[PDB]
Amino acid sequence: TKGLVLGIYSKEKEEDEPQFTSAGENFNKLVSGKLREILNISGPPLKAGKTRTFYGLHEDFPSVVVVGLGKKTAGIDEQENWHEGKENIRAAVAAGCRQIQDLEIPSVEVDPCGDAQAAAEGAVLGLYEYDDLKQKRKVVVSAKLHGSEDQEAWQRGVLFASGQNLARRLMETPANEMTPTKFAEIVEENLKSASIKTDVFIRPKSWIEEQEMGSFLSVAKGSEEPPVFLEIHYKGSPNASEPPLVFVGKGITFDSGGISIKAAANMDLMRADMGGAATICSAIVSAAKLDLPINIVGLAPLCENMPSGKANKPGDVVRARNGKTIQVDNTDAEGRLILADALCYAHTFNPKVIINAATLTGAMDIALGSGATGVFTNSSWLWNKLFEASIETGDRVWRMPLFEHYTRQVIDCQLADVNNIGKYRSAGACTAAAFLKEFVTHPKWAHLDIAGVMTNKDEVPYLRKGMAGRPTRTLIEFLFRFSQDS
Amino acid sequence: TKGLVLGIYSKEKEEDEPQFTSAGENFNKLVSGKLREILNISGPPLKAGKTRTFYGLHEDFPSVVVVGLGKKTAGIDEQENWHEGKENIRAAVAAGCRQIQDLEIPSVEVDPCGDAQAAAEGAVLGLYEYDDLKQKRKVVVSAKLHGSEDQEAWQRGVLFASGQNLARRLMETPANEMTPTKFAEIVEENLKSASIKTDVFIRPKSWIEEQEMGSFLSVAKGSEEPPVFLEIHYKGSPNASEPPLVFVGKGITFDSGGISIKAAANMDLMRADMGGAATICSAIVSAAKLDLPINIVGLAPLCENMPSGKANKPGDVVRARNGKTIQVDNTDAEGRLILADALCYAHTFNPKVIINAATLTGAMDIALGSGATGVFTNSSWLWNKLFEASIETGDRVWRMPLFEHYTRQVIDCQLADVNNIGKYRSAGACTAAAFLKEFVTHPKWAHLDIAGVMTNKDEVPYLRKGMAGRPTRTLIEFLFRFSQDS
Amino acid sequence: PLVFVGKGITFDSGGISIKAAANMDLMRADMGGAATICSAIVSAAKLDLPINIVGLAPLCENMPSGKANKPGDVVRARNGKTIQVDNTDAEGRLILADALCYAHTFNPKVIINAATLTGAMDIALGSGATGVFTNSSWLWNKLFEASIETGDRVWRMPLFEHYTRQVIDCQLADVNNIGKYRSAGACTAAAFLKEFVTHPKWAHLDIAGVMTNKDEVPYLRKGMAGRPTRTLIEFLFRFSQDS
């Protein structure tokens, strides 16, 4: 059994009937107009993201799912900050593929819908499900481009989507499996499979201690799970000495909050508190697969945050790699602690830019939810590049303020140079960002608080319920454009 | 456009292919085997509750939805306490009708599926949606029996389902619309439309005061919304002097908890705190439509429970109609307060049985959730009758204990004869039931705590998300059988 | 005229969806939206700006009583849209729905509303800046530029259908006065308001985070801040000269 997903646009006022994509019209022609005929008979027109299934139209395609693509000329939506057409395609195709999968069809050919990359992303992101630990699973669906004219674009979409799906897998996987060591090993095998122009160092605790990362170590010690500092190098630049772009990701494989223990409700989701590491590492893996002509370094401090007889204690003062002391008033604000040391280390690479990602604050979720990743940056150039890339990917970013106003609230510290929690409970994502900035001197640094986009329920149509792996594609697009432009 | 819902059973080992119902096979014959042909082509067999849509099979039915009915011989499931076949039909048909509605088809003919009543209930309960206050609504679907051989059974199903839908409407409707007065007027018009052998008395506050219902009055006074004591009579017995069956329902049109105010989260659902009144009144309306040969009296104290300068105050002692004093330690345990007076009044009718329904305790929800209505009764005969009726309707009941063990915890009262909350927080539904029992001397009394079945998310397949109107059909079935048996 | 709308809840107890006792006294400033836009207009008048301005401020208290809004109640806005009041403490958007509808009758050049609308806004940006939701980048830029001068900063927040979807997914009515999820509270609140706006140049300022000052703004003693009144004044001044 082989399924087929075909797109149809919303009817324009000047048109007598909704128009099929080129593939749709061709298939209709192939079946002597039976597709149009049955679609007409089926009832109301298919709107954006809606689907309808027709059976027995062609011996090779017992199941044909037509999906609504919305307005054919839908481009950049000035109000939504994204290319609407691409988003329509991703959603429609995802919906179509899910329908094919529900019919238990193992193979599906997908209409490029005028944008093969978007179509591929919809199919690949849409079909993804982390079901490795389930006895009962949906049929594995192999999605392929319908036709052979948009191959590179289609594969580009598969690549981008696969990068995000890698992040989703890493985030979704339970923490007892996805330990710091396991995460590092999976990223290592993926990066090495992507290109041999790579180096991966799964730095052990001894190295971390040697690097004087007391902040990171303070978080890790509460747990019996060994911490690791993942360092990955992708040497894509023609010039080996070319300064690299450095990505840093919060890799808390599991966050119980530590002594400042979290509430039980939905704490299981904290297995994705390493989403920052997942997204930046996956983006680098994808950059390597794209063979981007740039040098990139990925840094991911990985550990668990657990309560125990040797765990971080509220009030404890720890020393970051840069010598700055930190008062750990709340052990559940551990992401900024490990990032302090990772960000310090990031400067040793004399990077062109430093971008960190982290499921850093619930405040970010309360601020923008899953609508967009919050971006704190001291460079409007960098903000604009990330923003422009997000318009293309649809995985939106929204700028958040890096004001001294917030810095003042974290450096007002009773015992040390900086407190790991603001003196007020307001603007949690902003004070967390201000804290990170105290460990950054680089002129082009961007902090992405992805706590709000850590999961998906139904907000992003082409992502099934679960860890979202956002905004991996936006980072990939950013890297791609940087390798071409910047 | 006219849609068609046809059923197909799960294939038995001895059969070469899954068997259609009589209507399905006949339609297939009508379309020269095209239905079977396309179903075969469509893929995997249809399992219970699953559906698949085929277009253009017949000029009169552009859309045909085949629904899986499960095992043809599925009967009473000893482990689930219900007739599985009927439940399969209700679910499958509901699913089929929802599919027809999504296609925006205004008319649908429904396969009786070997049990027209179950089919009708699935279609009518399944299509129901309270959308009176919405500008955007789904297409109104008119469901009718496919064929003309199972008319009475089909109409019986429509009647039962309509009774439940009336309860759902009353429960779902916002409290500012569904006031005590409005509820009474809607029940009145429905009962009177059902039969002229009825009397309805929308008793005003003056009557309530005359009846010395101090407990009920104490609850109502906090709100500016006038309370009413709905009294409905259905004189179906050939003998006017025949003792009536008396139904009592908690009619709190809105419960804020009063001075013992509720938390904000999901308090909107308390607009259905009159579900007890809704279900028993709807059951009586349906009994009247069925023209059951029995006398039935419905009693529903209706009021709001609001905080104000004259509302019930914790610790206040009120006097029930029977002279018993009640210490109101928690003003949010108001349902038992109004029921105390209604139950007392119920005895004046020298009833054969007294059955009250109420969304009485969150404890009931914690106990059985929406799996079944908790039934507290001092009569195993009555319990068995309710239980047997529930097997048929699928709207299950589960017996809960009326032990002195619980009574002791409510009569251990600091200031009065009985405390409106137990001395311990355990067995909340049982102590609430024990409280009610202090106002009952009748040998055949059953208290139904329907708090757990007040709403539906997806537990009952044939009920869309919202107020469930449960267990209205079980009460109707009980009445029907009582009119025939008892 | 340019039309300004301000949430004027003189006191908010939350109503039946009653607030916690801690610091509820600050809710006497839940009319800050009305205060800032009205004050800005007074100042515009004192500046004798050559423009027509209309100020709209629905004013009332939100109290619990025997006749108060009940969770689940469905009310009808001036534009005929029904609203499910799931949380009576999300009352600012309820009164603004009617005020925003009325604002359109003036065929305004722009519609700007201010409101101490969500605690989510405070959690989002605190007192660092007023959150600005607008369907006009031109309007956003004008407000932003004015804020640079006044120092009473504004920061743009998203008006995405993403949030709209979460408020129009309503059990009983056209729109629910609280999102289906607890995330992005200021954004869903803004989306709710947008359902009562058809104007091409509308800006919603959630000033809940800048309602008070402790010591963040050096030149403001502890207490209600009256922000971002000056930014609105500057905006009006420049509009009277430029736009």
Ligand SMILES: C[C@H](CS)C(=O)N1C[C@@H](Sc2ccccc2)C[C@H]1C(=O)O
């Ligand atoms: C998503 C983050 C990172 S794991 C997180 O859970 N935080 C960070 C801080 S915020 C915070 C909460 C209270 C006082 C001070 C700061 C602690 C914890 C929380 O919200 O209680």
Ligand SMILES: C[C@H](CS)C(=O)N1C[C@@H](Sc2ccccc2)C[C@H]1C(=O)O
């Ligand atoms: C569903 C019922 C009826 S409205 C309800 O809400 N109850 C009844 C009592 S239980 C209760 C709770 C604490 C102490 C004593 C009794 C009060 C209220 C509640 O759960 O807090």
Ligand SMILES: C[C@H](CS)C(=O)N1C[C@@H](Sc2ccccc2)C[C@H]1C(=O)O
């Ligand atoms: C500052 C605003 C306006 S007065 C406010 O207090 N809100 C608005 C809503 S948010 C909200 C909270 C819980 C569920 C749904 C929405 C209610 C109240 C609050 O935070 O509990």
Ligand code: NA
């Ligand atoms: Na994980």
Ligand code: NA
């Ligand atoms: Na109701």
Ligand SMILES: [Zn+2]
């Ligand atoms: Zn934490």
Ligand SMILES: [Zn+2]
């Ligand atoms: Zn964390």
Ligand SMILES: [Zn+2]
């Ligand atoms: Zn109550």
Ligand SMILES: [Zn+2]
């Ligand atoms: Zn109640």
Ligand SMILES: [Zn+2]
């Ligand atoms: Zn409020």
Ligand SMILES: [Zn+2]
């Ligand atoms: Zn308010």
